[model samples]
Target: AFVVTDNCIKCKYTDCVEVCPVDCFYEGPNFLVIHPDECIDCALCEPECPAQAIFSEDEVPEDMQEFIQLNAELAEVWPNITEKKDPLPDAEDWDGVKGKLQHLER
Candidate 1:
């Protein structure tokens, strides 16, 4: 299944989500995660990420420790958006889009 790597932290541009044909992704507080159950293993979202955050579950770098769980966690709470929906309004130029949402520490 498709997995989100460290780069997606906060970028949640939904670019990956947008391109995903199965709509198997969901948004986390600071990243976008893919549902292992929902993902079709298409590997389509990998190239769509600007941050280069998404990866195959088995190949995910060891440093990106929680990415698998991140996907599973978000798969629940994250609101669903269809492919036709415009990118999220707050997704652009947002503090966290380029990197981790630092304010989460504050």
Candidate 2:
């Protein structure tokens, strides 16, 4: 499974959603999460992310580890998003910014 971490908190780029083979991505107010059980480990979404926020579960940064669980928790409730859409209006400005977990919207 791939985990969407803090970098994706405000960016919410849907590039990954377009490339996901399983359509496992779920949408929130300002972020997206991958369904852990639905992900086929295809690794397609990783590079598609402009923010480089998607990572394999085992490869997730130590600081981003909580997002592994966060993805699962949110995916279970958020609506599925299989098509690409415009990212947050300020996505580029937020890309690569650190400590974005505080800004993540449910």
Candidate 3:
């Protein structure tokens, strides 16, 4: 159960969406999340996360708060990406992007 974290807000680089073997990644308003039932648990997405925002369910930090349910629920309404995906051009340098957590508020 890979989860999207707060850091993903506004920096919705779909990099994690592209590398997913099963196309389980889904878009949120400002981020992305994985469907627990759909994920193959291949662990390929672990390192592919440029924001380091994706994490195993149990590994999510104590302060991560709502990420677990956020991951699951977002998957339900997410648009399928089978046809194609947008390029996350900024992904290369976004992992260490500063102040992303603050940007979510705007």
Candidate 4:
């Protein structure tokens, strides 16, 4: 499964959503999560992320490990989002920012 980590919290870039062969991404208010059970491990979305926020479950950064569970938890409740859409208005400002998990809007 691929996990969406901290950098995705406020940036919300949808490039990964566009390339997901399994349509596993779930949309949140200001973040996106990959449905763990639904992901096919195709590795397509990993490189597509502009913020470099997506990673394989095993490869998720040590400090960002919580996001592996975070993606699964949020994916259960967030709406499915298959098509690409514009990122957050201030996405550029938030990209690569640290500790973005604190800013996630559910």
lDDT of each: 0.66, 0.91, 0.69, 0.91
The TM-score values for the models, in the order shown, are: 0.72, 0.97, 0.74, 0.97
Candidate 2 global TM-score: 0.97
Predicted structure 4: lDDT? 0.91
**RMSD score of candidate 3 (Å):** 3.4
- Residue 1 C-alpha lDDT in model 4: 94
- lDDT (tens digit, per residue) of candidate 4 on 62-104: 9998998889899999999989999899999988889987888
Q: Flag regions of model 4 displaced more than 4 Å.
A: none
Error of 4 at 10 (Å): 0.9
Candidate 3 deviant stretches above 4 angstroms: 82-106
| Residue range 20-82, candidate 1, lDDT tens digits | 888877654555667789888988878877667778888888766566876777677776655
By lDDT, the best candidate is: 2
What TM-score does model 4 achieve against the real structure?
Answer: 0.97
Candidate 2 Cα errors over 4 Å, as ranges: none
lDDT order, best first, reads 2, 4, 3, 1
Please report the TM-score between candidate 1 and the true structure: 0.72
Task: Report clash pairs, candidate 1.
Answer: 5-53, 10-30
Candidate 2 structure quality by residue, lDDT tens digits, 50-87 = 99999999999887889999999999999999899998
Q: List the residue pairs that clash in candidate 4.
A: none
